[PDB]
Amino acid sequence: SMHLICQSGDVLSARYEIVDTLGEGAFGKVVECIDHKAGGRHVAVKIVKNVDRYCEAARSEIQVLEHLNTTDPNSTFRCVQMLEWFEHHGHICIVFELLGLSTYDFIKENGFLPFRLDHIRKMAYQICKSVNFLHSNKLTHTDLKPENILFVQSDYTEAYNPKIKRDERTLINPDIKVVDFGSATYDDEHHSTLVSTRHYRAPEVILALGWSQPCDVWSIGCILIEYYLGFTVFPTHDSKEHLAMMERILGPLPKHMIQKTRKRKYFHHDRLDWDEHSSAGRYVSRACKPLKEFMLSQDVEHERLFDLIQKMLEYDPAKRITLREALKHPFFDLLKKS
Numbered sequence: 156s157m158h159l160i161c162q163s164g165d166v167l168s169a170r171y172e173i174v175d176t177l178g179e180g181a182f183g184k185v186v187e188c189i190d191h192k193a194g195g196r197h198v199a200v201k202i203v204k205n206v207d208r209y210c211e212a213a214r215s216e217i218q219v220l221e222h223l224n225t226t227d228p229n230s231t232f233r234c235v236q237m238l239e240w241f242e243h244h245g246h247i248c249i250v251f252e253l254l255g256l257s258t259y260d261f262i263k264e265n266g267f268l269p270f271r272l273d274h275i276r277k278m279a280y281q282i283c284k285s286v287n288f289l290h291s292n293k294l295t296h297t298d299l300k301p302e303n304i305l306f307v308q309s310d311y312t313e314a315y316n317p318k319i320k321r322d323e324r325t326l327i328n329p330d331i332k333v334v335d336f337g338s339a340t341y342d343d344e345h346h347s348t349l350v351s352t353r354h355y356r357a358p359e360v361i362l363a364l365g366w367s368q369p370c371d372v373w374s375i376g377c378i379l380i381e382y383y384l385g386f387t388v389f390p391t392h393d394s395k396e397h398l399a400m401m402e403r404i405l406g407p408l409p410k411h412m413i414q415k416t417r418k419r420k421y422f423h424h425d426r427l428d429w430d431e432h433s434s435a436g437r438y439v440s441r442a443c444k445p446l447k448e449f450m451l452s453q454d455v456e457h458e459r460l461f462d463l464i465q466k467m468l469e470y471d472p473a474k475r476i477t478l479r480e481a482l483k484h485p486f487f488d489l490l491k492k493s
């Protein structure tokens with residue numbers, strides 16, 4: 156269905172010639188096009204699957220982009236600019252400015268090797284600045300993950316290394332933009348039950364205690380530790396295991412969240428229902444240690460990052476640091492020297 160309409164050489168809306176695939180999600184596909192009606196400018200086109208759910212998410216995304224782009228026409232807060240949208244054989248296609256690689260693709264293709272601290276600081280700052288602007292405008296992203304943070308530019312170099320039989324990519328400039336408003340929710344709109352991709356889901360989302368701007372802050376915390384290590388500290392699929400991993404890495408869950416939740420399946424009285432002395436239990440234990448033991452250095456700038464990471468992963472969303480305050484954290488002082 157989608158396969159039949161996203162081929163190299165295909166022409167969309169009598170101007171956009173597909174030259175390459177940039178990526179794939181559950182929503183569908185992102186393709187690189189030459190725009191023959193804008194002097195041959197390369198753009199990005201999100202082709203949405205002709206399914207009810209993804210169609211309605213795409214109409215929702217278009218509405219959010221019109222708002223964010225109108226409010227911030229210079230993209231000072233780094234949300235991707237939408238150029239226009241059309242229908243091609245029943246599929247909604249959204250045209251955007253072409254950006255470079257996802258942070259996900261860059262880490263994955265370098266063999267899950269982390270970003271440098273200097274790069275992470277700049278990227279964290281821009282991610283917080285961009286998501287804080289959604290926060291100012293009565294939005295929650297809900298689906299922040301490395302796949303949805305793209306480098307503005309192809310500002311990197313690439314060489315084949317025959318020792319390890321892949322390309323290695325070296326970042327020059329780490330500037331990013333935030334993409335995918337398919338899930339973004341206004342404060343007064345109906346809130347989805349489940350939101351976020353398992354690895355980046357806040358404990359208030361897992362426990363169905365209600366969610367808000369603070370669930371984004373949790374996701375950014377998870378992104379930052381993945382950028383620093385090259386992998387997530389929550390490598391799991393299952394909800395309970397995910398909660399076991401939070402206990403190991405971050406310390407016990409607040410009793411009030413455990414007792415308030417209707418998600419009682421996960422618990423037994425006051426505590427996670429988790430045989431730690433079992434095979435799957437000892438496995439989680441091996442994979443997990445207190446957060447600050449992931450630090451690769453005791454240098455103070457590593458202490459700075461992990462203090463912010465720890466405040467972003469506060470269990471209680473009423474307590475969790477805001478992006479307004481995260482922007483002011485000591486980790487960022489290095490960017491504001493003068």
Ligand SMILES: CC(=O)c1cccc(-c2cnc3ccc(NCC4CC4)nn23)c1
Pocket residue numbers: 177178179180185199201235251252253254255256257259260302303305334335336
């Ligand atoms: C994934 C998504 O929703 C999205 C939305 C708007 C624009 C883009 C976009 C713009 N330029 C590019 C260049 C690469 C790209 N990669 C897709 C991400 C998923 C790994 N997406 N992309 C992606």
